[PDB]
Amino acid sequence: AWKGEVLANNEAGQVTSIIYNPGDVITIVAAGWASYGPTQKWGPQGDREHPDQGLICHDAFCGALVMKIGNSGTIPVNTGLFRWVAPNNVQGAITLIYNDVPGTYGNNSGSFSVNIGKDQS
Amino acid sequence: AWKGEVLANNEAGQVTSIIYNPGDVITIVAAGWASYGPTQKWGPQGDREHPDQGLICHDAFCGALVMKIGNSGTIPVNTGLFRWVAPNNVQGAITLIYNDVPGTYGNNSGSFSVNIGKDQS
Amino acid sequence: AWKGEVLANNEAGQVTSIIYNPGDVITIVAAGWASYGPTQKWGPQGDREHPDQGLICHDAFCGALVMKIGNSGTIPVNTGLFRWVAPNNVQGAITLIYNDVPGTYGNNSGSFSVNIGKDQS
Amino acid sequence: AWKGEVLANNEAGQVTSIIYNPGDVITIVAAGWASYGPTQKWGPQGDREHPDQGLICHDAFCGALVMKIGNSGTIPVNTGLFRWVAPNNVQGAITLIYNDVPGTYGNNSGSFSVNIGKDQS
Ligand SMILES: CCCCCOC(=O)c1cccc(C(=O)c2cc(O)c(O)c([N+](=O)[O-])c2)c1
Ligand SMILES: CCCCCOC(=O)c1cccc(C(=O)c2cc(O)c(O)c([N+](=O)[O-])c2)c1
Ligand SMILES: CCCCCOC(=O)c1cccc(C(=O)c2cc(O)c(O)c([N+](=O)[O-])c2)c1
Ligand SMILES: [Ca+2]
Ligand SMILES: [Ca+2]
Ligand SMILES: [Ca+2]
Ligand SMILES: [Ca+2]
């Protein structure tokens, strides 16, 4: 299992110790509060009122938690995933990232606390 | 495992199939959007700007997911719990509930989708 | 989880740390060599050539590993059980016992090494 | 998870669907009765009285269950392995094999039933 913090202001994303292999079943739980700029804060699902303009992951809101697995594209995590199996041919190390627009992470604040474990399979 | 929806207007809470027994290790993942009355919606950690004026759970925000286990008081769930063990003396059936003030559930809207499983021990 | 030795001369059996509750899924692995009398020894499936003339568990061989769950009657374990769920209405502490005839444990020798864990459910 | 039978007379061993990847934790439970020649039978620990006269695995008895992970050397399985982790550099498909002397498989009989799964990590 891996536990750690994902800073909203970390454009590169936080690499985890988890290597996703074919067939693997994993669980992720994400909590806390962060911002893409405003004094207001949002949870891991982000700000459902913010537009999608140039976000790294078009499938989640601004300020959501997303991930990449190896060199996949971005995949939504949000609050987390229960006993989840990736699509065919997705494999590698799990990096977690705050969903925002490239070049705009400087004004971000806060962090999410995230756990990831491999489940029985 | 149990998977189901928790309606925000359900004052009694959603009973699950899960019986928490001494020594159990559990994982919960909650997702979605709901409202304790306003047109806006919030995720499982609720509205961090809303005052607590009589919530069923004073350790979580208005609109957050909470639970009771058997005869326990409310216990925060929020986005979820990763490989969690219950407080001393806590055991029994898990009921999931939207955190709002007694008697004001009629104007709530939405639902959270929740998964619960028992982990290896 | 629980790891321990079960002596073949132990008539009362070895009580583990595991309490079996409804819905639980367990795995058992048993290894080693023991005897009900002879200078020879057998593994956890026992002696497939020996008669049953009053074994505590009529569904396994003399010299096999068996168990009780709470006040159940005996259940075969043998080499082990993989992600097993018990019959209805069985609950309580797991007691591991060597399968022999009541009153004859005194000439027994050796032990099995046993791992028990609860699995994800 | 994977379940299947491993014949005593199969010199090549039985390929499973389990790919052991670095950091995997696995459980294996084996049961049953087989023979490397004699009319009598033995369990997955094999025959503790028979000499090693060129077994494919010199760390288990003749008639024991062993395995390869990819093109590893032989690894003892016996009755099973509880929440086990492989040696460094060991990875690939798990192949289960009856431990006998090469070219003597033709007088073998019986089989073992084996479950393998990956465990929480
Ligand atoms: C795809 C990379 C090129 C984008 C350049 O344009 C932007 O930076 C751009 C364009 C439209 C909306 C936004 C936006 O939603 C946005 C998001 C932010 O977190 C933020 O801090 C700022 N900001 O600092 O101005 C803008 C940003
Ligand atoms: C029948 C209910 C008893 C009323 C007690 O509630 C209050 O007086 C009171 C005062 C300030 C804020 C709140 C509150 O946070 C609150 C929370 C709500 O979800 C809600 O639907 C209502 N509401 O519609 O009246 C008020 C409630
Ligand atoms: C030995 C004290 C009295 C128990 C009574 O045992 C029997 O009546 C009975 C009758 C038939 C077979 C067996 C038997 O399978 C049996 C099994 C043993 O492990 C053992 O050590 C002995 N023993 O030492 O005599 C007998 C026992
Ligand atoms: Ca920003
Ligand atoms: Ca309300
Ligand atoms: Ca005896
Ligand atoms: Ca042979």
Residue numbers in the entry:
A (entry chain B), B (entry chain A), C (entry chain D), D (entry chain C): 1 to 121
Source paper text:
The notorious pathogen Pseudomonas aeruginosa relies on the lectin LecA for host cell adhesion, invasion, and biofilm formation. LecA is a homotetrameric lectin with affinity for d‐galactosides. Importantly, binding to LecA is highly dependent on the complexation of a single calcium–ion present in the carbohydrate binding site. Following a different rationale, we recently reported on catechols as orthosteric, non‐carbohydrate binders of calcium‐dependent lectins such as LecA.
